[PDB]
Amino acid sequence: KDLLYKYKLYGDIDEYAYYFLDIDIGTPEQRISLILDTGSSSLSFPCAGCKNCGVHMENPFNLNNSKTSSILYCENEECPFKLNCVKGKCEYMQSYCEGSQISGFYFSDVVSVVSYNNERVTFRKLMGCHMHEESLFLYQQATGVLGMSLSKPQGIPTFVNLLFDNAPQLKQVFTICISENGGELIAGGYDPAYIVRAEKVVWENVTRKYYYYIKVRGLDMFGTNMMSSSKGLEMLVDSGSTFTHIPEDLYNKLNYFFDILCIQDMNNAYDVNKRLKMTNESFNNPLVQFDDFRKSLKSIIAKENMCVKIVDGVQCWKYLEGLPDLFVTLSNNYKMKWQPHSYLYKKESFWCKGIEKQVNNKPILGLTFFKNRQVIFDIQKNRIGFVDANCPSHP
Numbered sequence: 001k002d003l004l005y006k007y008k009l010y011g012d013i014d015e016y017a018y019y020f021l022d023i024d025i026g027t028p029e030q031r032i033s034l035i036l037d038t039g040s041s042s043l044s045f046p047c048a049g050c051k052n053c054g055v056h057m058e059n060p061f062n063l064n065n066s067k068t069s070s071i072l073y074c075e076n077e078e079c080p081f082k083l084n085c086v087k088g089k090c091e092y093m094q095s096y097c098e099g100s101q102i103s104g105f106y107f108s109d110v111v112s113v114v115s116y117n118n119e120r121v122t123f124r125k126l127m128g129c130h131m132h133e134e135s136l137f138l139y140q141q142a143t144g145v146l147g148m149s150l151s152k153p154q155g156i157p158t159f160v161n162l163l164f165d166n167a168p169q170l171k172q173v174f175t176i177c178i179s180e181n182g183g184e185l186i187a188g189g190y191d192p193a194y195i196v197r198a199e200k201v202v203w204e205n206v207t208r209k210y211y212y213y214i215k216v217r218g219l220d221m222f223g224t225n226m227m228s229s230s231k232g233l234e235m236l237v238d239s240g241s242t243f244t245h246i247p248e249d250l251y252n253k254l255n256y257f258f259d260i261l262c263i264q265d266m267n268n269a270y271d272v273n274k275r276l277k278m279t280n281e282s283f284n285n286p287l288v289q290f291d292d293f294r295k296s297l298k299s300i301i302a303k304e305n306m307c308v309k310i311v312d313g314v315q316c317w318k319y320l321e322g323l324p325d326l327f328v329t330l331s332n333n334y335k336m337k338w339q340p341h342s343y344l345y346k347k348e349s350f351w352c353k354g355i356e357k358q359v360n361n362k363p364i365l366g367l368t369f370f371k372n373r374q375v376i377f378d379i380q381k382n383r384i385g386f387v388d389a390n391c392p393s394h395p
Ligand SMILES: CC(C)C[C@H](NC(=O)[C@@H](NC(=O)[C@H](CCONC(=N)N)NC(=O)OCc1ccccc1)C(C)C)[C@@H](O)CC(=O)NCCc1ccccc1
Pocket: 013, 014, 015, 016, 017, 018, 035, 037, 038, 039, 040, 041, 095, 096, 097, 098, 099, 100, 136, 137, 139, 140, 145, 236, 238, 239, 240, 241, 242, 243, 362, 364
């Protein structure tokens, strides 16, 4: 019975490698496309002075054309929020995990968020103008980035806290529901009607106050626990991470099983049979649920589910059929099912593994953990929810 405001998301894993939405900024409104990013806190984009940025769907935001825009000046005053002051403006800067360094200056202006059912919420936000962009940002259709994390006590008020402060008719919950193509952002709750069958939401406490981290205790495949370490892994729930990132030790164990499932020479029956026998020797023992492993192999072989490899040895199958579920054990020791229609993504006519080794010791639950689920950010109760869903698609 909760009031829900719904926003269209566009995007995919293979071609965009993010999901984005449109927002209005300034007076009169300027439509701007933003990467939906629960892994950062800012709202930012190029602005018209920019001489070192990338080309995007929209022209850089034009400050002179917004009657309500206001650049944040300093060095005749102090920069609030402990920001740097360079050449008289409060400096915007962000280092991202992928390696991008984005810098510029801060300004505030009116933000208008409008649902596709014409429900409008409007407020001023302190936003960053990109004056320098880098690397992946130079090859990106989306114009800017919309961080969805929470405000710190003496920090910049973020989009999400502002949205709810100016929309008291909504409960402080946002849900991301991504498909292979586009998806949906919901403010005010989740939609039970999208839920598969009717399946129940699996809840976890967030492990840090202003960021979306949860603990993962185990990661099973064919009945084998691949996590070697005792402390649960603290993983960022990040819609701005194309893939799910895991430790090397963990990745290599999973990848060993995925390598065997990846048969690149089905035309070669002799070599296939050799793989089968090699697999029976190696894994027909109590360390593995061998039944399921052979079940998976036979399915893959019977349906001629050919595999090919792409960059860094990532495996791509013709079909989802035959691939096993992975099982994620969360904090309260719930064993959650991670299906191939999530951890594999569509690339051309194949389904490719959306799991990588981590960089900088940062484990991340990325879009391949969001896909075909409702991921529910219950800000009020400090928890994140997961449930299998038929998410909307765009286009
Ligand atoms: C939009 C993006 C820059 C947001 C950022 N995500 C990331 O940095 C991740 N980036 C990715 O997954 C990127 C995002 C998409 O491309 N990036 C872009 N256009 N700018 N994907 C990506 O590299 O996949 C490669 C690719 C590129 C093109 C086509 C197909 C595949 C890293 C982890 C691999 C954010 O979610 C995490 C972050 O760095 N936040 C900064 C604050 C912080 C710092 C440390 C920990 C937690 C938070």
